[model samples]
Target: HWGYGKHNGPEHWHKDFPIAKGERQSPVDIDTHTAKYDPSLKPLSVSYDQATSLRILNNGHAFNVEFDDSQDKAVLKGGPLDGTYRLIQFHFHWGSLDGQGSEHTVDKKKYAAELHLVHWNTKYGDFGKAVQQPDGLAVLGIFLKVGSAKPGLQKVVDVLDSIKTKGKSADFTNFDPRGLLPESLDYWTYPGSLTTPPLLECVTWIVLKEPISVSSEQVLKFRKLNFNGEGEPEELMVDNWRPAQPLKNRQIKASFK
Candidate 1:
């Protein structure tokens, strides 16, 4: 029921989802000056298998690559996470232009795009069940800059033309998401919510400090995607990113000094 249009944008979400204005909302601007370095926080550990990738689809809100999360074949641990979390899916948020798209900003600076790898705690039955718990999810947010064409992302880009409309999907397998990460895993960790509606505050957000690069042309290709399904009025799937929310009483911790 929510679309990032002038009438139903982020500004209007709190009307239906009151938690959208809750204290622990996500996509907060990370003020490097204010975030304290936490020596207690361990380095993040990510173990992924390309074989777990199942399919990629246009989910109306954003195009997501769903993974087979039946097992812990691909899991994330350490860092701010209490236990192993199963990788469920990964998606991106982008803007109509190159300068601004990222959800979580660094000192109020936006990136060309943002990649979110959504994982749910295995302790909970599954992603659906995990969603209700406070420590349910651990999302890794990687900022995307416009520069070189990322070979790792090219695989996803190659399949975009096939899923041009909402609800369209295609088989996308053997895709290694690790290839999309930056060299450094240094990140800022905080308590937050899902950036989209239902805005549930159940995420332990680990946003990487370093960003990955993708060419400007590749970004334009993603914009070609339609937010509306086939036979519906056509609308470009651009500017799908939610802006920064108030930090509220949350304290962000940095893994690096």
Candidate 2:
């Protein structure tokens, strides 16, 4: 079971959650200034039908839409990288409040929140086996900032009341996650480790320099989601974000072409 507040916040998640100690983690800070620009990187074509199979899940931290890999309609190919990958799951990393919710930082600047669209190589057969391989994963990072109200995100936040309780989830049928993608599909591509454990230096990070804005109310609703397991109802799972880590020797490359 997880709890909110300082001691048990996202920074210390690895300590409490053993599985989190993987080689690759999410929510890393993207330092654009230090990033190298590469003309070879470009946006890969992805189908909408595969994107529609997204399944909403409440994993104690936040509401994540897990993809149905069975629908092999969406495919990411070309760029500095080339391969047929399938969307696996996508989730958000936010702060307890809207003031500071972003997970990736660039030149010390933080956005309101961060969204991760996770994908895996179909060559490996399944997500379970792909996760263990170095080149098996591909993730798109999109930043979210608190600004004017965005009707697109309303479909997601509106269901907050239904998942207000920890470990509780409801089907968000007919929900299209593609609408949530930023207009600027252009992104920065690079090889980096998962910001979270094992911290494997595998995932090819495609982070969008542009960010989409959502209302302050939506940010608050994300914070209100359940955190703890079935132990105690009193415990709140407001903050589940991990702190930013050093980039180490990782180099970020942008899709200039």
Candidate 3:
């Protein structure tokens, strides 16, 4: 029953998932002035092979592009991690407005949307096995701002028309996940959690300082997605981001000084 609706939303999540209120929760505010500049942080190394992209699914919460993580096809190395982490899936969180939908805010500023590329430690073998452990997950958070159409994201937008209803999915291929990333690999790192329910305290969050551009028209198309399935009340999908969490004395390290 835990949903974004007034009664069963994030506020009630902690009742079912105690970890929602855990100390290392994610989606915290980034106070750039106070964030430490760590010289030790290494440059990020990210490579995703879209050839292994399975398909895109509309699980009602968001659309996810799942990957074949059996091997090192798509891996994240360096930057806040000791070993390689494989990309399992990449999804997004957006809002009803053009201004504020991103979960991770910077200096109290929220972006148009947020992208989360979920990864798991190689040691744990798979996403399910690694997700709850202490050093298990790494979510690369990218902010999306409104601007001209992003050619890189055109394919993703193209398929949105076919999947206007929940339970509808289509094979998503010939895509490079890299296009979703910003030009600057520089980011702020911290120990956090999954932004959604069962919010385990495991992720090493790498939030890019720069945001990728998405045209306002494309962003509005996202609203056309129905939260309800066929024959339902047809609730428009929007404002699917979690609110910011308390930092609770955790240190955020920046890749650039």
Q: In terms of lDDT, which candidate is strongest?
A: 1
Per-model C-alpha lDDT, please? 0.93, 0.69, 0.88
Candidate 3 local lDDT, 1-257, one digit each (tens): 66677887788899999989889998999999999999988899897753378888887888888888888998999998989999988989999998889999999999999999999999988788897688899999999999988888878887887777778888987678977878899999999999888788888999999999999988887878877777888788898788999999799999987
User: In model 2, which runs have C-alpha deviations exceeding 4 angstroms?
Assistant: 1-26, 196-201
lDDT of 1 at 94: 94
For 1-257, candidate 1 gives per-residue lDDT tens digits of 78899999999998999999899998999999999999999999999863389999998999999999987788999998899998999999999998999999998899999999999999997999999999999999999999999888989998999999988999998999988989999999999999998999999999999999899888889999999999999899999989899998999999999
Give residue 19's error in model 1 in angstroms.
Answer: 0.6
**Stretches of candidate 1 exceeding 4 Å from the true structure:** none
> Candidate 1, which ten residues in sequence have the lowest lDDT sum?
45-54
TM-score of each: 0.98, 0.85, 0.97
Judging by TM-score, tell me the better candidate of 2 and 3.
Answer: 3
Best-first order by TM-score: 1, 3, 2
Model 2 lDDT, full chain set: 0.69
Query: On residues 32-127, what C-alpha lDDT tens digit does candidate 2 reach at each position?
Result: 677777765666665556465545767666677765677576556666556778887778878766657676677777777888878888888987
Clashing pairs in 3: none
Q: How far is candidate 2 from the true structure (C-alpha RMSD, Å)?
A: 2.9
